[PDB]
Design a protein around this ligand. Structure first.
Ligand code: RDL
Ligand code: RDL
Ligand code: RDL
Ligand code: RDL
Ligand code: RDL
Ligand code: RDL
Ligand code: RDL
Ligand code: RDL
Ligand code: RDL
Ligand code: RDL
Lengths: 152, 141, 143, 146, 152
């Protein structure tokens, strides 16, 4: 529970890793973090798996941004399937942080949205690592990452 | 016997409480363990860890897909993970998903989700102690 | 000698297992059969796998009925994927017997259709177990 | 010396196996062949895997005919996924030979098309087994049917 | 030291392998490389896996071209899933280089686009093998392989 892996891409149009890392060190100052950047979405799964199995990461955050196009939705889906499988093969959680450009109305909002979502899931990593009990307290409360919570 | 119950913070309805209460009702002594994850896609590995690392004989996965057309994709990916976790452990994972699209309002959504959770809680029971009952109800309707 | 596992559901609106079992015992009275009923479609894969690996079944029949919704089509697809994987992980066949309600024009026909399909695949199980040569003779059907 | 497994179905409306087998024995009268017929598309994966792992096949050909209904497209897709997995689990190639009825304008053409495709992939099996170098020579030359 | 596997197809209407190979040897003269050609898209996964596990490749490039038909889109998707799985099963990266004909307006452009994308991913292979740090420096920059980068 002392090590987190953060995998992002060169394809993404927003730097989500910096915000995540800063949030984790904030909650746990001495936590160990390792980063790895790959070209894009479909390169994340094996990078996340290698970190979990070869670098001793207890958990990993996968940061990606599918483009607007339809086929990008397919690539995302394929990438997400890879993430699901990597987790089942290692029995370790991979927090998926994907932000579709279709969600923002502009680049200012897209940048805001991605960083906010990254940071919020960074708290989820924290809770999963040290306060699993908190999440249960919030069970069924309709929490969201990025835009405002929806609530019960 | 032990049942694992995994739910989420994303869900807008608490389905776990109703399930747990139903199980303890049918079997007062059954041991139950809970684990809450952020959302739908985080359920598979949590269910698997419970089956393999906490001795759960069976697990209930509680989730609530969003309304968007993409949440349908996330749900589908999550369900695939649940299918695989089961095949990899040879243990059942009762999937309890409730799409918001099914209810006409939050009052109905809350009712529907809890009712479905509780009913599948009975299925867990039957699978654990009375597998014969389910056969009696085979293809019934 | 040979054992067949039959897995059905409580969700299905038609009893397809009885017809299948009767057909198998007919073609092979010395056939051993073990049944297991689960709630629905998505619960079939692991039940089929447990039968193949934990109960010594040489082959298994999976009986299910997806509903009409386009969702149900997704659940069916996910269930079928599970069946495909269970087979590859055990190197044993799982004869999938799914009947969508959309295929029948009403209940009478649905009941007929499901039972007829179950029974016909029951023959396929038979052939796969004792007369694999027959199937080859029928390779590529004839229209 | 090498062994090739051929798996087809009773669902298919065209016999694609005969043409393939004849083509292989033609190019390699010494290749070893072993056939297995299953009910349909979704029964091919495990049959192909059993041949690769239990019968010593070096490679396998999967012959199937998806139907016209979109439901048939889903089954095909699921079947193809099984074929992909069987290969990754054995580290052996499975040449997928599927022919959708939607491709022909009639049976006359459907029968021709299926047999032609089966036979052409039968050459691919040959090349993969004995002349892997040939395929490289044809890398990116748009081999399909045009 | 360091071996790159390159797998392409006879189905593809453009030779993407030559450009990739030339780019790698350019960036790493002593880089070792082997090639394997299969019929098409769906034959790539096991070929890539055999190279990673049986020929000692540290990484592999998969070059393919889905055809026009939407049927092709399904085959592509199935092929990509195979690539994702091969990677998770070997803990080695497989750089997917697919080029849909739908992306070009003509063959002149299709040929240009495929070669340019192949070459650019050839640099990604390079970076992944020797300068993983570079990719991190470009994290979130919105880089593309093929058409111009999008940028953050
Ligand atoms: O991060 C990505 N987002 C996308 O929307 C997208 N779309 C595509 O069509 C696409 O090919 N990619 C690239 C992909 O993730 C891989 O980096 C590439 O296949 C090399 O392995 C990406 N990558
Ligand atoms: O709360 C969210 N957390 C996420 O990690 C996440 N990831 C995604 O890829 C994503 O698209 N979303 C948004 C969600 O799908 C919906 O669009 C949103 O809830 C509005 O209906 C979310 N929403
Ligand atoms: O429970 C969820 N239901 C959804 O419909 C949904 N949709 C999304 O697009 C989405 O990203 N999520 C995220 C999920 O809650 C987790 O936070 C995510 O799997 C881990 O990063 C969820 N989560
Ligand atoms: O009876 C049901 N049990 C469930 O677990 C379940 N889960 C779901 O996600 C779900 O959508 N349904 C209902 C489904 O939409 C259909 O109405 C049903 O299959 C046919 O009546 C059901 N229906
Ligand atoms: O047999 C089923 N047929 C269906 O059409 C259908 N549709 C649904 O939306 C659905 O949730 N189910 C149930 C599902 O198969 C599982 O039994 C349920 O999720 C419990 O794990 C079924 N089950
Ligand atoms: O003729 C069939 N035999 C079967 O065993 C079988 N099994 C199935 O699971 C199944 O869905 N079908 C349906 C069939 O393929 C067609 O989609 C249906 O007839 C609609 O035209 C059939 N159809
Ligand atoms: O070869 C097939 N082509 C199809 O289009 C098709 N469609 C269907 O709905 C269908 O059920 N099948 C049969 C399937 O391949 C299996 O044989 C069946 O599920 C059990 O044996 C087939 N089989
Ligand atoms: O050349 C082909 N070889 C095949 O093995 C094959 N298999 C198929 O299932 C199939 O549908 N096709 C044809 C396909 O529809 C396209 O015409 C072809 O990919 C050219 O774009 C082909 N086309
Ligand atoms: O490279 C390919 N691109 C395509 O668009 C395409 N479409 C098809 O319908 C198709 O069957 N193929 C061939 C496929 O990739 C395999 O080579 C073939 O199944 C032999 O195993 C391909 N192959
Ligand atoms: O930049 C890209 N690198 C790739 O490797 C790649 N591969 C593909 O198969 C592919 O379709 N693309 C294009 C992609 O679909 C998008 O159009 C592009 O990312 C624009 O956002 C890309 N785009």
């Amino acid at each position: 529970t002392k090590k987190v892996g953060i995998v992002d891409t060169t394809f993404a149009r927003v730097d989500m890793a910096s915000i995540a890392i800063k949030k984790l060190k904030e909650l746990s100052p001495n936590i160990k973090i390792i980063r790895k950047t790959v070209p894009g979405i479909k390169d994340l799964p094996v990078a996340c798996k290698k970190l979990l199995e070869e670098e001793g990461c207890d958990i990993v955050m996968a940061l990606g941004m599918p483009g607007k196009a339809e086929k990008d939705k397919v690539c995302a889906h394929e990438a997400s399937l890879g993430l699901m499988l990597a987790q089942l093969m290692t029995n370790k959680h991979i927090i998926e942080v994907f932000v579709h450009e279709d969600e923002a109305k502009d680049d200012k909002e897209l940048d805001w949205l991605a960083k906010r979502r990254a940071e919020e899931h960074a708290e989820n990593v924290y809770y999963l690592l040290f306060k699993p009990e908190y999440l249960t307290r919030m069970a069924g409360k309709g929490l969201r990452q990025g835009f405002e919570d929806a609530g019960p």
